[PDB]
Design an enzyme around this catalytic site. Sequence first.
Site, PDB file in Angstrom:
ATOM      1  N   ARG A  33      -9.060  28.812  24.455  1.00 53.68           N
ATOM      2  CA  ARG A  33      -7.665  28.724  24.863  1.00 53.68           C
ATOM      3  C   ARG A  33      -7.549  29.027  26.353  1.00 53.68           C
ATOM      4  O   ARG A  33      -6.608  28.594  27.017  1.00 53.68           O
ATOM      5  CB  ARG A  33      -6.799  29.686  24.049  1.00 53.68           C
ATOM      6  CG  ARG A  33      -6.591  29.266  22.605  1.00 53.68           C
ATOM      7  CD  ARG A  33      -6.040  30.410  21.770  1.00 53.68           C
ATOM      8  NE  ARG A  33      -4.879  31.042  22.391  1.00 53.68           N
ATOM      9  CZ  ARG A  33      -3.626  30.634  22.220  1.00 53.68           C
ATOM     10  NH1 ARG A  33      -3.365  29.588  21.449  1.00 53.68           N
ATOM     11  NH2 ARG A  33      -2.633  31.272  22.823  1.00 53.68           N
TER      12      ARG A  33
ATOM     13  N   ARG B 247      -2.297  44.622  26.801  1.00 54.42           N
ATOM     14  CA  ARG B 247      -1.717  44.146  28.052  1.00 54.42           C
ATOM     15  C   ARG B 247      -0.308  44.686  28.273  1.00 54.42           C
ATOM     16  O   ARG B 247       0.325  45.199  27.351  1.00 54.42           O
ATOM     17  CB  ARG B 247      -1.694  42.616  28.076  1.00 54.42           C
ATOM     18  CG  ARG B 247      -0.927  41.996  26.922  1.00 54.42           C
ATOM     19  CD  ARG B 247      -1.184  40.504  26.821  1.00 54.42           C
ATOM     20  NE  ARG B 247      -0.633  39.943  25.592  1.00 54.42           N
ATOM     21  CZ  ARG B 247      -0.873  38.711  25.159  1.00 54.42           C
ATOM     22  NH1 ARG B 247      -1.660  37.903  25.856  1.00 54.42           N
ATOM     23  NH2 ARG B 247      -0.329  38.287  24.026  1.00 54.42           N
TER      24      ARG B 247
ATOM     25  N   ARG C  47      -3.243  39.347  11.958  1.00 57.76           N
ATOM     26  CA  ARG C  47      -3.087  40.402  12.950  1.00 57.76           C
ATOM     27  C   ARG C  47      -1.616  40.514  13.331  1.00 57.76           C
ATOM     28  O   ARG C  47      -0.925  39.503  13.465  1.00 57.76           O
ATOM     29  CB  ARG C  47      -3.943  40.126  14.189  1.00 57.76           C
ATOM     30  CG  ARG C  47      -5.441  40.209  13.946  1.00 57.76           C
ATOM     31  CD  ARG C  47      -5.890  41.639  13.682  1.00 57.76           C
ATOM     32  NE  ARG C  47      -5.757  42.489  14.862  1.00 57.76           N
ATOM     33  CZ  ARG C  47      -6.118  43.768  14.906  1.00 57.76           C
ATOM     34  NH1 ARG C  47      -6.636  44.349  13.832  1.00 57.76           N
ATOM     35  NH2 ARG C  47      -5.961  44.467  16.021  1.00 57.76           N
TER      36      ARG C  47
ATOM     37  N   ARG D 276     -12.966  27.561  34.810  1.00 55.41           N
ATOM     38  CA  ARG D 276     -12.972  26.832  36.072  1.00 55.41           C
ATOM     39  C   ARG D 276     -14.008  27.370  37.051  1.00 55.41           C
ATOM     40  O   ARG D 276     -14.525  28.475  36.885  1.00 55.41           O
ATOM     41  CB  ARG D 276     -11.588  26.882  36.722  1.00 55.41           C
ATOM     42  CG  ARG D 276     -10.480  26.232  35.914  1.00 55.41           C
ATOM     43  CD  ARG D 276      -9.207  26.151  36.739  1.00 55.41           C
ATOM     44  NE  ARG D 276      -8.086  25.589  35.992  1.00 55.41           N
ATOM     45  CZ  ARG D 276      -7.173  26.317  35.358  1.00 55.41           C
ATOM     46  NH1 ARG D 276      -7.248  27.641  35.377  1.00 55.41           N
ATOM     47  NH2 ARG D 276      -6.184  25.722  34.706  1.00 55.41           N
TER      48      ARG D 276
END
Lengths: 391, 391
Positions: free
Chosen positions: B176, B288, B257, B180
């Site tokens: 996901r 986060r 989850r 790069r």
Amino acid sequence: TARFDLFVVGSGFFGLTIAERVATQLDKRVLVLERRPHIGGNAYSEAEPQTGIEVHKYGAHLFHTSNKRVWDYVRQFTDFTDYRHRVFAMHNGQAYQFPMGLGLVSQFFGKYFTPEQARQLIAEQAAEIDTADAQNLEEKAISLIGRPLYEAFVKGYTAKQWQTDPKELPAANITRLPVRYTFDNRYFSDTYEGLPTDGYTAWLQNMAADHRIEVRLNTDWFDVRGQLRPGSPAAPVVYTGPLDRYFDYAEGRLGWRTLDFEVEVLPIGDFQGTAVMNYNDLDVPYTRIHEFRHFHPERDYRTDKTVIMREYSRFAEDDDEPYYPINTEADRALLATYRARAKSETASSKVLFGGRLGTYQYLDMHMAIASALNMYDNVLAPHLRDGVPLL
Amino acid sequence: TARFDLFVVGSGFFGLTIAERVATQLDKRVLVLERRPHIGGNAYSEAEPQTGIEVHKYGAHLFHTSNKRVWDYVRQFTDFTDYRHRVFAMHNGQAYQFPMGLGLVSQFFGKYFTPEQARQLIAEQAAEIDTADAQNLEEKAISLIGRPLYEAFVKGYTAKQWQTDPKELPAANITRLPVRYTFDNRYFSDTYEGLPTDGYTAWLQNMAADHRIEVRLNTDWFDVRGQLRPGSPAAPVVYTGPLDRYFDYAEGRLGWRTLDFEVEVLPIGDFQGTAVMNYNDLDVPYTRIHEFRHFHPERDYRTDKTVIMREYSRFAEDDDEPYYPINTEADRALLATYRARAKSETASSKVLFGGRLGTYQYLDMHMAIASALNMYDNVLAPHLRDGVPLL
Ligand SMILES: Cc1cc2nc3c(=O)[nH]c(=O)nc-3n(C[C@H](O)[C@H](O)[C@H](O)COP(=O)(O)OP(=O)(O)OC[C@H]3O[C@@H](n4cnc5c(N)ncnc54)[C@H](O)[C@@H]3O)c2cc1C
Ligand SMILES: Cc1cc2nc3c(=O)[nH]c(=O)nc-3n(C[C@H](O)[C@H](O)[C@H](O)COP(=O)(O)OP(=O)(O)OC[C@H]3O[C@@H](n4cnc5c(N)ncnc54)[C@H](O)[C@@H]3O)c2cc1C
Ligand SMILES: O=c1ccn([C@@H]2O[C@H](COP(=O)(O)OP(=O)(O)O[C@H]3O[C@H](CO)[C@H](O)[C@H](O)[C@H]3O)[C@@H](O)[C@H]2O)c(=O)[nH]1
Ligand SMILES: O=c1ccn([C@@H]2O[C@H](COP(=O)(O)OP(=O)(O)O[C@H]3O[C@H](CO)[C@H](O)[C@H](O)[C@H]3O)[C@@H](O)[C@H]2O)c(=O)[nH]1
């Protein structure tokens, strides 16, 4: 029966904006005279043969503005991409987030700084000078990012770009860069930003496309003005060339900076993985490297070749095209004399002065176009339509 | 004379997309039944009282897609901002550029790497596994970013988000994230991206605004289906709730989850200077931190207060709303049984299954809407209009 209603010296963004407005909104004939073999000035771009990648021949141009009137105006001649310009800085063999922000700070000091902690740190390092004071580049830069960041990311770069002591350089030069305390690494802080979808040349061509506009390439105004102006004696003149050159450097030569470029097509798909990489260290001659494939990520180019451009800075000579006005103490004093002379030429010969070179000003594309729209609205349009004096 | 032409269980993006299409394009009455007191599912947002900042109540939602049909569809109900989502990663007290790119690489290894040099470095560190193989999360992650980057930025994060061994986790989970070798730190690689200009709720309300659509909040389908369906026996049912719940966990409970959030209003203007900061280290409980003021930089909020949200991950229980499907070896086997059961319910009771919860799939907003448009075009629309069977 005059031949032309207006003379425009220079086919840059200022000149073409003037020429387009007068021809379209006033229905009058405009003769644009360009010394170069092409139009657009430094904004002229060309497609590199091997890759088809658009190359900004005379320096990378990134359009950006917060002026909606300018934004709506330039959109008549071109569409703009979703591009948002970002710059990285090379220092001691490490790529740094740029400009002033949490990315730059955290990388350079080896640990993460909260927006509050970062403000605290810089406040200490910006001790000996406050922004309310600070008349030159060195003082203003230190008062914005602190001294340690000034040494590493400004002093060396400024040394190569100007070769002039930062205490003699204007403070307006460093304030072009956004000072932030977030992770926003957008190199500009304008509402609108993007690149011409079909290139700068197509954009510039559409501005001078009107049939009432004639562009004479490879023609110097000083050579042919004695012949042209009698053909249409009432027609005013918009001069966008070097101000000191217009009077043959009568009171002295203004301080300019010029640029030299090395365009190279590498047998690799990606040279630096970003559009512009600033080189702040002195162990390298060039100021920065452009990679034009990253200017248009929406376009798909061949991944076996890339086009890069190293940028070099030196003092502008006689035969050089001026890129940057230096505007030191002496330069601004010399400029003051020419402004008086220009003010006299306007009253005696109907000659206006505008543009980067015409006004000895550090003008971006949008500021030049805005300046042109201002000159049109308040000076040229009232004159050509209502006979109002140019002063 | 039936009361409703369609039953839709769940007012999430899937359900509302189904309800909107059937009501508008087929001119039929749709009853939407929502167990929650509000619509939109996890996409429901609310304005924080003290600041007016929109808060994504059940996790930060960032819209992005490369599907123009979906893009043109969602634009009928809302405008989108110019926002481009970027994520930074906290590791050992240092903020890192994210995801995989030259920014991440150069920071973590202490020096700048060219796109060619970076590919070389990772190629060495991705030795023991090649992407062509790699069935699980751990193998695929290492084969994409190398092992040293896997340890520091994946292993710890994955441990907190899943609490499941990465060799049992799907490889589709880590893919996901864009891999790069440039300085592009955009967290998504889609053509179109942005946030709802007037918030998610306004967007969701406009999709269920049609008068032929009725939304019954605080209503559980299993409680009222025995009464509703006889009122309109030909009307099919679109179920978007937990698949295992629909059969009362007959063959077992699927692995899910769930997430818990701590919303806090700080007396400072900026907490972290960016929208989302990932915490990859284990010395911190949350995965986060979101700061919603940075979600809409075009909006101007008060600079004396800010709203942040710490995100916690644990195993979904009985009374918990499921957020993420785990899809381990056992979970997919259990899913296979329910798919057969669902295929039977479709043939015996005209009951369709779609959505994140309805199909036990890791679906983003655009993938859910696209999945809904697919179900409409190929299943529901031919059925309600042309009598074509649901199988
Ligand atoms: C390296 C570089 C990067 C830049 N990047 C940006 C950027 O990213 N974004 C931005 O907004 N701006 C940028 N700029 C600035 C921008 O290029 C100028 O604002 C722009 O050229 C404005 O046009 P101007 O007509 O005022 O000056 P110019 O366009 O240079 O126009 C002057 C023209 O007058 C002509 N001329 C001069 N003398 C005579 C004569 N005697 N007879 C006939 N013709 C004459 C010249 O041929 C020239 O074409 C950049 C500039 C440089 C040098
Ligand atoms: C923390 C987080 C962040 C995310 N970020 C993004 C992002 O940035 N970009 C992106 O594209 N996607 C993101 N997603 C994913 C996105 O939220 C889903 O794709 C989205 O919810 C799709 O809708 P869905 O209807 O398929 O599932 P849901 O919207 O959760 O819809 C399910 C609905 O069914 C209802 N329901 C369930 N059972 C019953 C019942 N028995 N009776 C009545 N009603 C019932 C529920 O109340 C719920 O409202 C994120 C998800 C999470 C958890
Ligand atoms: O890393 C840096 C960057 C800037 N500066 C100082 O800041 C001044 C201005 O910086 P600019 O980025 O504006 O320099 P340029 O004018 O050359 O930049 C030009 O090229 C840029 C391309 O990245 C931008 O598009 C910009 O708008 C355009 O004018 C410089 O003179 C310099 O003294 C530094 O010292 N170090
Ligand atoms: O720093 C990271 C980031 C991701 N992962 C792994 O990659 C998987 C997927 O990462 P996601 O960013 O997709 O995790 P989320 O699904 O929680 O992300 C959600 O929240 C994000 C907000 O920044 C995005 O909007 C994203 O679309 C949305 O699904 C994770 O399970 C995790 O195992 C890591 O290990 N470390």
